[PDB]
């Protein structure tokens, strides 16, 4: 068979490496020398801690990882391609800093689009990421943003996560809707931020070809409601994520989760303080309030991605070969 992806050396970063390092933090450790790191990549409108303090920072620590995260400024609202420089740099650093050992990446919302962008276009990290555990990823963007012609002034990453954007087009045409490392995608038909998610099929924004694609309603029934934040914080998500992180295959396993795990409330192993914070988690909507970059057209694609979106309109014009 065949699966094609970009090849060669990694494209150059627009940000200096010191600036990208400044966006990476590990709890209790230095990225230069870390035991069993996991890289956490946050959603639009949030920092690492705002997305994960109430959930996978303590949960991954109790599973024996050192939690590390990136907080691309300002609040993941800048150009998704620049947010991805933070992720690629972080994988490079943490892979070296754990002894040249592959490490897992765990994400929410835009974070997963960033992880898959980096894996598609930065070949050096494909052998450095052990597995990807993505919660409500928007690999096709979301139809609840926009539409394409109604985006004036919006932050850069909001233009880019609108359905039909040049960025989501380039990702798809370059082969990035197929999993590149073992990947598990946990998402919900009742996500109020990322749609469409209702088909349990490759139409869903969270779906990756050959991924372990887990729509909550496929397991727990069509009347099982779990919202965007709940997709990250629930006991169901914890059982699936724990299975993915420990699996000998790199993906969650059906033998490990099932209807006995269909609990949409905050993960059982969180403290009561943590469950309260998780159940109240409003981070997905932080981008409605925070000050972002001003952007009057969809950000241009970097040269490594531009050839995959011929005919789409960005700041410079309509992409050609």
Residue numbers in the entry: -3 to 317
What did the article's authors report about this structure?
In order to gain insight into the basis of increased activities of QW4 and QW10, the crystal structures of both enzymes were solved and refined to 1.85 and 1.88 Å resolution, respectively. Surprisingly, Cys105 in variant QW4 appeared to be oxidized to the respective sulfinic acid. Directed evolution of cysteine-CALB with generation of mutant QW4 led to a distinct improvement of activity for a range of bulky substrates, which are not well accepted by WT CALB. The raised mobility of loop 137–150 in QW4 and QW10 enables ready entry of bulky substrates, which can be attributed to the introduction of the V149G mutation. Interestingly, the nucleophile exchange (S105C) in QW4 results in a conformational change of helix 277–288, compared with QW10 or WT. While the helixes of QW10 and WT CALB are well superimposable, the helix section P280-Y282 of QW4 is deformed and shifted toward the active site, with an additional H-bond between Y281 and E188 formed. This conformational change also induces loop 289–294 next to helix 277–288 to shift by about 3.8 Å towards the solvent.
